[PDB]
Design a protein around this ligand. Structure first.
Ligand SMILES: O=C1CC=C(NS(=O)(=O)c2ccc(-c3ccccc3)cc2)CC1=O
Ligand SMILES: [Ca+2]
Ligand SMILES: [Ca+2]
Ligand SMILES: [Zn+2]
Ligand SMILES: [Zn+2]
Length: 163
């Protein structure tokens, strides 16, 4: 294909739900981080993300600690910050964030917006990139969060799947 293992969504309007929050940020700050992370992908693709407040969404977002029901346990502070599942029904698309992290909306470690943007790449069908400037690079690095600019390698990736 282009990246087998990873598939793709069959429709362009996807719903998301934030299931819980982190004490590290206000509820509004979490909502804004997640919304803007989706917007990054939306402005480079045909995808439209619609928030729901309750019920079943395509993409569930949640903060969990250690074992949390999906056979991929988190590991406490640092290390694994988050993970996400490839497009599909059920857990497909879902994104989990390690609740034991310091989550920020600054340059201090683990800016939630940046980590969420990376995870949502996985939720949409992207794998890791070898480009260190790419959001989809395997390791966390801070980058400026002032606008909705996706690095060009990530634009190439989402365009290759969805146009
Ligand atoms: O399935 C997984 C599980 C864990 C991964 N690593 S991570 O949670 O520690 C992580 C690494 C980098 C980022 C990131 C780096 C730079 C910009 C934005 C996000 C976010 C989370 C990556 C991954 O793909
Ligand atoms: Ca961790
Ligand atoms: Ca899902
Ligand atoms: Zn999980
Ligand atoms: Zn990743």
């Amino acid at each position: 294909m282009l990246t087998p293992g990873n598939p793709k969504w069959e429709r362009t309007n996807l719903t998301y739900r934030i299931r819980n929050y982190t004490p590290q940020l206000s509820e509004a700050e979490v909502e804004r981080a997640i919304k803007d992370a989706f917007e990054l992908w939306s402005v480079a693709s045909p995808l439209i993300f619609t928030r729901i407040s309750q019920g079943e969404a395509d993409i569930n977002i949640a903060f969990y600690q250690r074992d949390h029901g999906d056979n991929s346990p988190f590991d406490g502070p640092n290390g694994i910050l988050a993970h996400a599942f490839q497009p599909g029904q059920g857990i497909g698309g879902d994104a989990h964030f390690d609740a034991e992290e310091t989550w920020t909306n600054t340059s201090a470690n683990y800016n939630l917006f940046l980590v969420a943007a990376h995870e949502f790449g996985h939720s949409l069908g992207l794998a890791h990139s070898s480009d260190p400037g790419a959001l989809m690079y395997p390791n966390y690095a801070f980058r400026e969060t002032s606008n909705y600019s996706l690095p060009q390698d990530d634009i190439d990736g989402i365009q290759a799947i969805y146009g």
